[PDB]
């Protein structure tokens, strides 16, 4: 959920106070005052849409930063920055291959933790082996100790 909380960070927080007032409104129909699954149904009919107990509960999961089983206010910010289809360039076989050429610096086919640390250190931004290794895992669903390209897709899926 660090993408939605980064949007929170990268965007202004007065929109977040706006969503706080909207969440105060989201006590209406809320036997909890919050946005739970049922409360997401009623908040969305208060918001205009209506997701499903799976869609409401999954947005909950999709806003479960803490795993609070609800859409909390912070989770409601996540929601408002979460209910569309925008993450672009769909980097896949073609584009993530263009990338994997450098992700897998090796010109071989595996972003090992060294390939990943090198690519990150090349990003210019601050790099941690927490970063490098969490991203290894996001890769290493096959768990090669080294991000394969399928691991690379389980890692950078849609991410741009």
């Amino acid at each position: 959920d660090d993408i939605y909380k980064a949007a929170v960070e990268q965007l202004t927080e007065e929109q977040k106070n706006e969503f706080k007032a909207a969440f105060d409104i989201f006590v209406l129909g809320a036997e909890d005052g919050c946005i739970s699954t049922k409360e997401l149904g009623k908040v969305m009919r208060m918001l205009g849409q209506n997701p499903t107990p799976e869609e409401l509960q999954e947005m909950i999961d999709e806003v479960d930063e803490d795993g609070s089983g609800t859409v909390d206010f912070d989770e409601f910010l996540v929601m408002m920055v979460r209910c569309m289809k925008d993450d672009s360039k769909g980097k896949s076989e073609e584009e993530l291959s263009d990338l994997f050429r450098m992700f897998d610096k090796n010109a071989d086919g595996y972003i090992d933790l060294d390939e990943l640390k090198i690519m990150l250190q090349a990003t210019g931004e601050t790099i941690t082996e927490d970063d490098i290794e969490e991203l290894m895992k996001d890769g290493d669903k096959n768990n090669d100790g080294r991000i394969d390209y399928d691991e690379f897709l389980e890692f950078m899926k849609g991410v741009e």
Partner: peptide
Amino acid sequence: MQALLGARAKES
């Protein structure tokens, strides 16, 4: 959001 909030059309 716009047509709903009318004069206060703010969120989206």
